[PDB]
Amino acid sequence: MYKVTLKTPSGDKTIECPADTYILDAAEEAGLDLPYSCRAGACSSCAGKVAAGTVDQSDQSFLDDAQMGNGFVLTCVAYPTSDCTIQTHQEEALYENLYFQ
Ligand code: FES
């Protein structure tokens, strides 16, 4: 898998997310304070933030490719296309920016 360090409001943890399996599976495995939702992309409140590396969230709701470069991504239907660091609870970041990055 790819090693993605999820940045949670409680800290950070490196998970192993397969190139076929969405981050949240490995994310919850790692022990994050990450909720569980649809895994189908019915919303974007559970939108992770690509702090580092990259992931596959092309079919994200109202998030665009540029947002991924900005470091804004989806946790439900996305997984690392490389080893990365992914912020969790920063859903707003796609909506505005959250001023994190
Ligand atoms: S629950 Fe609908 S996208 Fe996470």
From Swiss-Prot:
Keywords: 2Fe-2S, Chloroplast, Electron transport, Iron, Iron-sulfur, Metal-binding, Plastid, Transit peptide, Transport
GO cellular component terms listed in the entry, alphabetical order: chloroplast
Gene that this polypeptide is encoded by: PETF
Protein name as annotated: Ferredoxin, chloroplastic
GO MF annotations, alphabetized: 2 iron, 2 sulfur cluster binding; electron transfer activity; iron-sulfur cluster binding; metal ion binding
Lipoprotein recorded as keyword: no
Subcellular location: Plastid, Chloroplast
Family per similarity comment: Belongs to the 2Fe2S plant-type ferredoxin family.
Full-sequence range covered: 33 to 126 of 126
Superkingdom of origin organism: Eukaryota
UniProt: [2Fe-2S] cluster binding residues: 38, 43, 46, 76
Keyword Transferase part of the UniProt annotation: no
Cofactor comment: Binds 1 [2Fe-2S] cluster.
Residue ranges occupied by any 2Fe-2S ferredoxin-type domain in the UniProt entry: 2-92
GO biological process: electron transport chain
Function, as annotated: Ferredoxins are iron-sulfur proteins that transfer electrons in a wide variety of metabolic reactions.
Description of how the protein assembles with itself and partners: Forms a complex with heterodimeric ferredoxin-thioredoxin reductase (FTR) and thioredoxin.
Species of origin: Chlamydomonas reinhardtii (Chlamydomonas smithii)
Required co-factors: [2Fe-2S] cluster
